[PDB]
Amino acid sequence: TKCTLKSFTVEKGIYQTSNFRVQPTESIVRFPNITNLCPFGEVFNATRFASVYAWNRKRISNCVADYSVLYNSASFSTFKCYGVSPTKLNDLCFTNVYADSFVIRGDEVRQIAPGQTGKIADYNYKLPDDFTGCVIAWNSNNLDSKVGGNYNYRYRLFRKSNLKPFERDISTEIYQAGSKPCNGVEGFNCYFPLQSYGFQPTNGVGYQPYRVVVLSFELLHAPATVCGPKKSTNLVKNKCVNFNFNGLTGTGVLTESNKKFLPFQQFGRDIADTTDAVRDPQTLEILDITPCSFGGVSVITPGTNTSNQVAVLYQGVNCTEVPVYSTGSNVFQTRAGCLIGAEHVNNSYECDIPIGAGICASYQSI
Amino acid sequence: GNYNYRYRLFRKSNLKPFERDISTEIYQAGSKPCNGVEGFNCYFPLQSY
Amino acid sequence: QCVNLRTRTQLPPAYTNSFTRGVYYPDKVFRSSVLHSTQDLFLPFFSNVTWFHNPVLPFNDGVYFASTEKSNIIRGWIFGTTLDSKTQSLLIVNNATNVVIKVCEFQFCNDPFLDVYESGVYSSANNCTFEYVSQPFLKNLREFVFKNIDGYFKIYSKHTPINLVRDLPQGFSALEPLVDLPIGINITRFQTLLALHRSAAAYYVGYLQPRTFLLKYNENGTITDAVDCALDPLSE
Numbered sequence A: 001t002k003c004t005l006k007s008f009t010v011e012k013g014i015y016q017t018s019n020f021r022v023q024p025t026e027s028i029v030r031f032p033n034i035t036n037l038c039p040f041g042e043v044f045n046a047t048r049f050a051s052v053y054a055w056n057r058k059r060i061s062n063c064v065a066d067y068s069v070l071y072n073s074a075s076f077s078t079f080k081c082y083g084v085s086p087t088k089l090n091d092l093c094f095t096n097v098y099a100d101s102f103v104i105r106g107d108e109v110r111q112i113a114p115g116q117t118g119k120i121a122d123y124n125y126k127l128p129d130d131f132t133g134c135v136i137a138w139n140s141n142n143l144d145s146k147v148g149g150n151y152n153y154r155y156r157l158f159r160k161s162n163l164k165p166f167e168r169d170i171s172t173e174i175y176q177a178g179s180k181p182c183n184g185v186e187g188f189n190c191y192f193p194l195q196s197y198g199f200q201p202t203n204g205v206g207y208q209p210y211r212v213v214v215l216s217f218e219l220l221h222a223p224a225t226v227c228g229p230k231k232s233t234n235l236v237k238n239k240c241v242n243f244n245f246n247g248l249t250g251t252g253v254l255t256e257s258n259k260k261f262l263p264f265q266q267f268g269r270d271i272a273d274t275t276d277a278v279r280d281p282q283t284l285e286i287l288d289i290t291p292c293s294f295g296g297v298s299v300i301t302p303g304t305n306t307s308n309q310v311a312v313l314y315q316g317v318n319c320t321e322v323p324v325y326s327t328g329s330n331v332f333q334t335r336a337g338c339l340i341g342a343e344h345v346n347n348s349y350e351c352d353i354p355i356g357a358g359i360c361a362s363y364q365s366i
Numbered sequence B: 001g002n003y004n005y006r007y008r009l010f011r012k013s014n015l016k017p018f019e020r021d022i023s024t025e026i027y028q029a030g031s032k033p034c035n036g037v038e039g040f041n042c043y044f045p046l047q048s049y
Numbered sequence C: 001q002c003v004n005l006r007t008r009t010q011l012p013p014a015y016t017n018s019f020t021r022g023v024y025y026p027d028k029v030f031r032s033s034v035l036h037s038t039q040d041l042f043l044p045f046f047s048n049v050t051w052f053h054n055p056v057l058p059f060n061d062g063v064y065f066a067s068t069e070k071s072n073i074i075r076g077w078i079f080g081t082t083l084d085s086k087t088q089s090l091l092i093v094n095n096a097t098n099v100v101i102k103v104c105e106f107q108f109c110n111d112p113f114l115d116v117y118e119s120g121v122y123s124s125a126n127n128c129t130f131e132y133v134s135q136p137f138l139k140n141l142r143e144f145v146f147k148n149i150d151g152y153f154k155i156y157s158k159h160t161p162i163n164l165v166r167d168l169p170q171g172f173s174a175l176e177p178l179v180d181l182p183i184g185i186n187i188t189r190f191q192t193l194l195a196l197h198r199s200a201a202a203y204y205v206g207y208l209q210p211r212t213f214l215l216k217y218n219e220n221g222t223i224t225d226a227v228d229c230a231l232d233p234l235s236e
Ligand SMILES: *[C@@H]1O[C@H](CO)[C@@H](O[C@@H]2O[C@H](CO)[C@@H](O)[C@H](O)[C@H]2NC(C)=O)[C@H](O)[C@H]1NC(C)=O
Pocket: A040, A041, A042, A044, A045
């Protein structure tokens, strides 16, 4: 009171000092059951991968993809990422994903990178210097390499120019290194641009077959529909908490409600555009939201010059949630709120310090 | 090429203004604990130029 | 397997009165016993709606489609701008078991028709992007509203049992939302699909315009009455 009045003495009366509100206890968040997972098992558990110059391309859109398990997979030799951090990509998401799968040599694993050159990097698959996404590489010597020679795999060795970003070259034209033309038959200056891979089970690290899949993320103006599930939690009732019901955020106390939502609404507002009811996305039931209690506090004093003790009134607050004056003295509940520090008397006198609803207080104690 | 200059690559949180960090410790990028030993999802936070 | 017919399908393009049909729930918010004013695309009251007894038609901002259907002869819809494989096209079919939605660059024929003895009105189907299958859509009145806003295709539907003979009956019936699709296309024309067996159908088409309406919600949240704020001075 003295601080609010900015004085060291207080006259008799009732003053309004500060406010009061209940604080949130914990937080909750709800989301639908989460289904329609992006097809990724058939990509990384596929039987065979195509050639490096004929890399398989897969388009991913309109699903939910959990990349945390891929990042936590212990069977992957190399898991690199360029555009974003591998840990936090599960939250942010773009509109579509492109997967390029192929098989290269052990020493050619670092050819597939921005700002890199090589036979694969310039003839089979070239990444733009501004590429965003990730690359997953793993040895497959026990599977792809053949004891009789895995010559089914083929790699491009010759081309007049390099490869454009995300461009596939499958041209089988006879490369003419020299100026002597050839009528489709390789000669001194004519050669086949594609050569079979000579993978063997016993060839050493660096020449063993390595399966590599490159994931690229694109953010066309169409709405983004592919990224990780949003983990939900349980719910509580009869507690002023803050909630995030399917992206609708607010603070209040949640109770059971008897309103009858029609089967396509999700939340309701009464008037002046204030939400009152929500539907939990999992259990599909109607809840009720109430703002948890608040109100002003006032001090009743007989005057600093007279005495030194005071009483406190919380305005429009039920006498159940009061919290140093948590117990104090006898506590009275009145139509105007709750009062602490004064005793109720059966007599009746002239009104000294008005309080409200037909009652007031005076000093004798208060 | 000059490699006497290095910059931080990994950090647990965001730096406060006018703050200095010089500790060189392995990063537990993944769920697997590195336990002070480099391995999968464990990289040196300093990157050269 | 698509060929043009011999005779012309000279469907008479008649006109009739809209009355007070074509009201749909604008959002998914529940309100009880309240009057709410909203501005959006609607079919104006007492408008002049076209009646067909399969020409290429424009799309404009939105489309209101009505069918005085008997025994479920209408089957689907086609959407697009160039209607060829050089641009994206949308296809919706409702056969006996389910409804199929495709977003591909087809090569339709000059007079598509379903045929009965699946889909053969298109010569090619390439670069397919979106596929969808769901429950079947359909003396009955079938009302549909088609909208396309910021890459979202909105489809609202309603079915009504009627006993009147020819024109749209007087009354009020709101339309619930049915389907939302997050596909970005700039559709400007559309078409009707009929299972024409080799051996003459009436439907009504109207357009939507931006305006403000006043809607009444009863205790249960059902829209039972509406007022057009631009019809006459009393309504204003
Ligand atoms: C490819 O298949 C293997 C075999 O099932 C998958 O590995 C399993 O992953 C689950 C998920 O953590 C584990 O509980 C199993 O113990 C694993 N089994 C084996 C034999 O490894 C692997 O996850 C699949 N890969 C993809 C991308 O789906």
